[PDB]
Amino acid sequence: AILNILEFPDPRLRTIAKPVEVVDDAVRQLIDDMFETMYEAPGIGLAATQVNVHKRIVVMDLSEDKSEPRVFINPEFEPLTEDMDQYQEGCLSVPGFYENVDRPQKVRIKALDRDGNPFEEVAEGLLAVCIQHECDHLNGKLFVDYLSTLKRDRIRKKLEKQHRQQAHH
Amino acid sequence: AILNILEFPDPRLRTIAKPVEVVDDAVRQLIDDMFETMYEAPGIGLAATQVNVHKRIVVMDLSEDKSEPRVFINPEFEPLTEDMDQYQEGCLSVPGFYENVDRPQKVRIKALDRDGNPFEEVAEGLLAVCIQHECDHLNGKLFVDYLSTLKRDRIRKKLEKQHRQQAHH
Numbered sequence: 338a339i340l341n342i343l344e345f346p347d348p349r350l351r352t353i354a355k356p357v358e359v360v361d362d363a364v365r366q367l368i369d370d371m372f373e374t375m376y377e378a379p380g381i382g383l384a385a386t387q388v389n390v391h392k393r394i395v396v397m398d399l400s401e402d403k404s405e406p407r408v409f410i411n412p413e414f415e416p417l418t419e420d421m422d423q424y425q426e427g428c429l430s431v432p433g434f435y436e437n438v439d440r441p442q443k444v445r446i447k448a449l450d451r452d453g454n455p456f457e458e459v460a461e462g463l464l465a466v467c468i469q470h471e472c473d474h475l476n477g478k479l480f481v482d483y484l485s486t487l488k489r490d491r492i493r494k495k496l497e498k499q500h501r502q503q504a505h506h
Numbered sequence: 507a508i509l510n511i512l513e514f515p516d517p518r519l520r521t522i523a524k525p526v527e528v529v530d531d532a533v534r535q536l537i538d539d540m541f542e543t544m545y546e547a548p549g550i551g552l553a554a555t556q557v558n559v560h561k562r563i564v565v566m567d568l569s570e571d572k573s574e575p576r577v578f579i580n581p582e583f584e585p586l587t588e589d590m591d592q593y594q595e596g597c598l599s600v601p602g603f604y605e606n607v608d609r610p611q612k613v614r615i616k617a618l619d620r621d622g623n624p625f626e627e628v629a630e631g632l633l634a635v636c637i638q639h640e641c642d643h644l645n646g647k648l649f650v651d652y653l654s655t656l657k658r659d660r661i662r663k664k665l666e667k668q669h670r671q672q673a674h675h
């Protein structure tokens with residue numbers, strides 16, 4: 338099923354997600370709904386926090402033909418270099434806005450797979466950017482948090498305006 | 507200490523490496539010697555089999571400045587995709603030759619780290635190719651084994667001539 342995606346400045350996006358203790362079929366059902374929601378948006382990644390489920394679960398598919406699904410449960414990352422890359426990021430929870438964000442160029446991801454088994458994976462490029470962006474969501478952080486207060490304020494005001502107009506529909 | 511690197515068609519390269527039961531002082535010394543040997547060659551990977559030590563130990567460093575050492579003890583891998591990647595592969599035991607070899611582009615690695623602790627790592631790109639190349643060595647397999655019979659024999663003949671001339675130096 339398609340799930341509702343929370344939008345900035347909804348305070349629920351600031352909730353810190355709780356770790357998953359057992360990866361059962363119920364967790365996999367949520368994962369399937371997250372994937373369906375992500376593919377339909379469309380987006381290349383999605384954190385449970387974004388659909389109002391505060392558990393540390395992330396889904397992703399960096400392919401063009403939407404044929405490479407990846408699951409990260411209880412994800413964490415550690416920079417493997419001090420070098421930083423700049424990427425213009427967008428977010429399904431901050432629809433319509435794209436801004437530059439500087440983040441570690443390479444990181445080591447650690448998480449549980451869709452079966453609950455632990456693994457690690459070195460990430461560079463888009464994968465590195467996405468994993469950091471998704472993990473941030475689980476810690477109640479949004480990419481607009483890295484921007485100047487004036488830019489974030491402009492975005493907030495534009496979105497709050499849109500929300501009021503959408504409410505008048 | 508820099509160890510000697512065996513070269514095709516030396517029969518000892520066909521030896522199947524035995525598993526490591528404990529990462530003791532001796533094993534720790536070998537790993538250091540292997541890194542020294544690898545960097546001096548220079549190469550981006552090295553299997554114990556290549557320095558005539560038939561234990562399942564692999565070292566790597568895909569960086570350009572010796573800043574990313576990697577250790578794999580008792581490594582094994584499983585393809586995670588059917589998609590094949592073609593890469594121009596070379597080998598310190600088959601110096602001067604680079605031939606295309608098709609291998610799965612994404613694999614899951616299972617091994618023990620430099621401290622003797624088990625871990626599983628998802629690999630793509632160069633890392634995916636190198637781990638398969640290195641594990642093959644531990645099973646007495648060389649990349650030329652994937653080439654046609656005439657191409658492999660041509661390479662063999664070339665090296666035998668070289669070895670012949672080197673001995674007269």
Ligand SMILES: CCCCC[C@H](CC(=O)NO)C(=O)N[C@H](C(=O)N1CCC[C@H]1CO)C(C)C
Pocket residue numbers: 379380381382383384387424425426427428429430435466467470471474
């Ligand atoms: C930069 C990496 C961002 C991680 C994923 C986000 C989706 C998200 O909100 N995850 O929490 C995404 O797909 N964002 C899209 C996006 O910004 N993309 C998608 C591909 C490249 C990049 C271009 O800016 C937009 C169009 C919704």
Ligand SMILES: CCCCC[C@H](CC(=O)NO)C(=O)N[C@H](C(=O)N1CCC[C@H]1CO)C(C)C
Pocket residue numbers: 548549550551552553556593594595596597598599604635636639640643
């Ligand atoms: C492609 C992966 C190969 C695994 C590593 C080998 C070394 C080896 O013999 N390992 O067992 C290597 O460093 N090979 C080099 C090599 O083939 N390379 C190094 C970087 C890229 C690639 C192609 O040129 C050459 C130059 C000796």
Ligand SMILES: NC(=O)CN(CC(=O)O)CC(=O)O
Pocket residue numbers: 406407408409449450451452456458586614628
């Ligand atoms: N073994 C894997 O597929 C690795 N991971 C995700 C990845 O592909 O990066 C686990 C998951 O998708 O459940």
Ligand SMILES: NC(=O)CN(CC(=O)O)CC(=O)O
Pocket residue numbers: 457575576577578618619620621625627
């Ligand atoms: N977390 C890691 O460093 C993983 N591994 C190997 C790697 O770097 O891929 C351990 C080792 O190098 O002993």
Ligand SMILES: [Zn+2]
Pocket residue numbers: 427428429430470474
């Ligand atoms: Zn987002």
Ligand SMILES: [Zn+2]
Pocket residue numbers: 596597598599639643
């Ligand atoms: Zn080799």
